[PDB]
A paper describes a structure:
Here, we investigate and engineer the weak disruptive activity of an existing therapeutic antibody, omalizumab, which targets IgE antibodies to block the allergic response. IgE antibodies underly allergic diseases such as allergic asthma, chronic urticaria (hives), chronic sinusitis and food allergy. Most antibody isotypes bind their Fc-receptors weakly and depend on the formation of avid immune complexes for stable interactions, however IgE binds its high-affinity receptor (FcεRI) with a KD of ~100 pM.
As a control for affinity maturation without explicit selection for disruptive efficiency we also produced a high-affinity omalizumab variant (HAE) previously engineered by phage display and taken into clinical trials. In contrast HAE scFv dissociated extremely slowly, bound IgE more than 5-fold tighter than C02, yet was less than twice as disruptive and thus exhibited a disruptive efficiency more similar to the parental omalizumab and clone 813. Consistent with their divergent disruptive profiles, C02 and HAE contain two mutated VL CDR1 residues in common (Q27K, Y31S/G), but no overlapping VH mutations, highlighting that each antibody improved its affinity and disruptive potency via distinct paths. In contrast, HAE contains a cluster of different mutations within HCDR2 and only one extends to the omalizumab interface (T53K). The remaining HAE HCDR2 mutations are distal to the interface and form intrachain contacts, but surround Y54, a key interface residue found in all omalizumab:IgE complexes. Within the VL domain, 813, C02, and HAE converged on a Y31S or G substitution that reduces steric bulk proximal to residue 32. This substitution facilitates the formation of intrachain hydrogen bonds in HAE and C02 at VL position D/E 32 and Y36 which form the posterior edge of the binding pocket for R419 of IgE, a residue shown to be critical for omalizumab binding. Adjacent to these core mutations, C02 and HAE both converged on an upstream Q27K mutation at the base of the LCDR1, and HAE contains additional mutations in and proximal to the LCDR1 (S28P, M37L) which are not directly in contact with IgE.
Numbering used by the authors:
A (entry chain C): 0 to 121
B (entry chain D), F (entry chain F): -2 to 111
C (entry chain A): 334 to 543
D (entry chain B): 336 to 544
E (entry chain E): 1 to 122
The structure:
């Protein structure tokens, strides 16, 4: 069953403002399985894994952004969200949502979204 | 990020021609082996587009990925191999370890077709 | 590096008729002296795996055979879940892995034809029955022989592995030797195939007489 | 590494009368240097004209085969041919021998069937052949249309498998076109087996109708 | 099957000559294989004396070469061992055997019963 | 001799029982290996009969010879092994090299059944 993920909510953001990104999932129900992740790529930098919410509801955060980031889902809309506060210049990046498939206790990102651009300007 | 597993790739950038054998190295600050497997994955990302998964668990090919891609290694030393480079393989390649939290990626290896 | 590993799909009979599908992870070429192998299962979705039964058998050839059978959900399998088997060996540093999923592609109902051989001199208390099942895809198929509405043991008949047709479809042959005592009781024998593309009930069958 | 040495096909032995035996080596690593493959006869008589064929494989294993023509009378007389495979990586060479099998002989029983017409395949029809209760297992199966033999790619034939009886059995399946059976509605299933009399040939005809 | 019969053994004076013949039945000594003479001294090991291939090549053991001749008669399907200048050490049981071939090397698969040659006085 | 290949057996003589395993050793002054094979043959000679071939080319069983006989070894060290000695195996056993001319035999190993 083919799965599609679409990010939305990107844009220009003031420093210190808050950010809400939503990932709309079609073709698969986010409560049925797999782990659902947010991964960002800063301009001219490597990929960074931000946050994950397991199908059963567990959430994990990257220490680098932990404390100012929340990952959530809305079962009715089959959508999950990323909320970040106290944005910085380092937060400027393209945010991708991905579905991680499970292998013997470890997860890899088999399905990715198109990504959405977040720009922060002082 | 002293506790975070750092991934270093080399080379940072390379230019090659179609048909060449391309070899990319990924070194881990801590071993990522567990239960007879290695939890190191390889992704391919063309510029400005989203990544694609190529290989998971060090050496297992993801479905639909051309057989010319192959991954190998153990412990802290891993290698992606493109046996016969093609024009559509112009991309940046990343390694990512999913053995330990948080998951981290390498810095990227840009593969330019000269 | 002589060890071998195999992962079988659910038989179509177990999937639709019994509605208790299972997949089996088969390990071969292991020396008795070698320590016992650790065998574990994993699902692509991250959902848990059921208890699996492990059987170990000595063989005439000196190589140990280990199998693990895992029950799977009917709707889980049909929906496209990926199950995975991992073999851990003390003598092997790296691990072997085998993966299975519902096979994807076009669907075609199986065509069924059943025939009876004419009697041959010296084989008079004997008769042989044949069935040709072809132009079905995917290759997953099960063949059963029923005599008098009661299905015959799988050990009575021999069926070939699915081979490609000159077209896109597959075909198999099934052969069954029947006694004079059987066909005199009731001279009807049924060749039944179970295939997901067959409609309805995933069953196509033909009857044949001696 | 595995090595197989086959006996002459009953067709080459009894019809063509140009028997050959093939020594097949598989699963040898492509990186490996070429394997040297040699022949020997128990009689000491020369062996010559062996042909060597290398072929890459999708699996990743290189396959090397060597075919050696043998005399029909020499073969039937009981000659022992031997194939030897030597590899630089292998400490010692593998050796395979082949000779005419001794044991009970049974002529093959042959049955030919035509599939009934199926919906959507007006112009296609499948023909089936069952050959059984023959031994030894060595057999050749041909399809002839219009007194002229059909190519080997047109039909599919199974390996000989043991029966509840003492004989072996094989199945042959041939897809024939509507245009072919309208030209001539007769098709021949032929088996070649040494016990068949005379000429080591047993055959049955089948018609589409 | 193949049968091999030795003949011509007997009492021989020292320094005399000896003619041994091996009559082959069931196979033609020109049709294949190697044809050999092998002698065993009383209570001692076997010694290979001479051979004639089916195609006609002959080989001799250096220990007896120069006073030993091997010949065949196709019509009689028989081969011979001629020995002159006999010595007491030549005293032995003489066997004829048919050698089967393995990739350039021969082994003695079929043997006769052998005939006794005694060369000694006092 | 001298330039000839010398074949030495041990033990010279041995006594055993029915069902027991017997092992005979054959040592050559020069190696008899060629082309990945060893051209060492084993013969059985019962009293008053002519020898009989058991194994050729070190380890290949002659047709009709019981499977309890087996040969092994390479170079200058060869071993005949009777897995389960039988009453009809009371015989002297000879090894013979057919690698180099002239072909030579060993001195023999008498096997008596106790
Ligand atoms: C790597 O990938 C490669 C390529 O995909 C794989 O290569 C093949 O691997 C096979 C593994 O064994 C093997 O092929 C065959 O092996 C059998 C084994 O024989 C033993 O086991 C069978 C079990 O059923 C049993 O029947 C036997 O008695 C033995 O105990 C060999 O017999 C095969 O040789 C015979 O068959 C071939 C093919 O005949 C059939 O298939 C052809 C199409 O290829 C088809 O035209 C025909 O109609 C048949 O259906 C013949 O070419 C041979 O001459 C042999 O035919 C037998 O019967 C004749 C009757 O007429 C006799 O005349 C004769 O005596 C003979 O015995 C075959 O070698 C090979 O190792 C290898 N290559 C091929 C071409 O298959 C490999 O598995 C894979 N490996 C990995 C690790 O990835
Ligand atoms: C020593 O004995 C061993 C006994 O295990 C031998 O191992 C053999 O290994 C081969 C692989 O080359 C196996 O072949 C397999 O057969 C199965 C058939 O299972 C069926 O499963 C599903 C449903 O359950 C069905 O859909 C399939 O079509 C099958 O009909 C295949 O699934 C495998 O892919 C593979 O073909 C043998 O099964 C196995 N032997 C036995 C007796 O099972 C080993 O080869 C022996 N070694 C020597 C040196 O002789
Ligand atoms: C390879 O086989 C040929 C066959 O005539 C033989 O002459 C040659 O000696 C063999 N090669 C080697 C390296 O022994
Ligand atoms: O390797 C054993 C066996 O595995 C399975 C089959 O589909 C074949 O590929 C083969 O005969
Ligand atoms: O593969 C060997 C064997 O496996 C099992 C069944 O599918 C049989 O029909 C088949 O012959």
């Amino acid at each position: 069953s083919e799965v599609q993920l679409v990010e939305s909510g990107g844009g220009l953001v003031q420093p210190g403002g808050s950010l809400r990104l939503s990932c709309a999932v079609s073709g698969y129900s986010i409560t049925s399985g797999y782990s659902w992740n947010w991964i960002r790529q800063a301009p001219g930098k490597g990929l960074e894994w931000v946050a994950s919410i397991k199908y059963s509801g567990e959430t994990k955060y990257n220490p680098s952004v932990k404390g100012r980031i929340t990952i959530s889902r809305d079962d009715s809309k089959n959508t999950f969200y990323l909320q970040m506060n106290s944005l910085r210049a380092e937060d400027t990046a393209v945010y991708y949502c991905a579905r991680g498939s499970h292998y013997f206790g470890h997860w890899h990102f088999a399905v990715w979204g198109q990504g959405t651009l977040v720009t922060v300007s002082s | 990020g002293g506790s975070d597993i750092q991934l270093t790739q080399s080379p940072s950038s390379l230019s090659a021609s179609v048909g060449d054998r391309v070899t990319i190295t990924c070194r881990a600050s801590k071993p990522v082996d567990g239960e007879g497997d290695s939890y190191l994955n390889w992704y391919q990302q063309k510029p400005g587009k989203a990544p694609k998964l190529l290989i998971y668990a060090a050496s297992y090919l993801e479905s639909g990925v051309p057989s010319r891609f192959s991954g190998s290694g153990s412990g802290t030393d891993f290698t992606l191999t493109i046996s016969s480079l093609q024009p559509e393989d112009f991309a940046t390649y990343y390694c990512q370890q999913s053995h330990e939290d948080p998951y981290t990626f390498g810095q990227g290896t840009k593969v330019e077709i000269k | 590096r002589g060890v071998s590993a195999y992962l079988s799909r659910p038989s179509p009979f177990d999937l639709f008729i019994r509605k208790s599908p299972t997949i089996t992870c088969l390990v071969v070429d292991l020396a008795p002296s070698k320590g016992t192998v650790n065998l574990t299962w994993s699902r692509a979705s991250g959902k848990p795996v059921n208890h699996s039964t492990r059987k170990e058998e000595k063989q005439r050839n000196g190589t140990l055979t280990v199998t693990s059978t895992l029950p799977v959900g009917t709707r889980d399998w049909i929906e496209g879940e990926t199950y995975q088997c991992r073999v851990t060996h003390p003598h092997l540093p790296r691990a072997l892995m085998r993966s299975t999923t519902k096979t994807s592609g076009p669907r075609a109902a199986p065509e069924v034809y059943a025939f009876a051989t004419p009697e041959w001199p010296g084989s008079r208390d004997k008769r042989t029955l044949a069935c040709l099942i072809q132009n079905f895809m995917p290759e997953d198929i099960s063949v059963q022989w029923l005599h008098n509405e009661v299905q015959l043991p799988d050990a009575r008949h021999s069926t070939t592995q699915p081979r490609k047709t000159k077209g896109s479809g597959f075909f198999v042959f099934s052969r069954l030797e029947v006694t004079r005592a059987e066909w005199e009781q009731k001279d009807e024998f049924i060749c039944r195939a179970v295939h997901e593309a067959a409609s309805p009930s995933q069953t196509v069958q033909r009857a044949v007489s001696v």
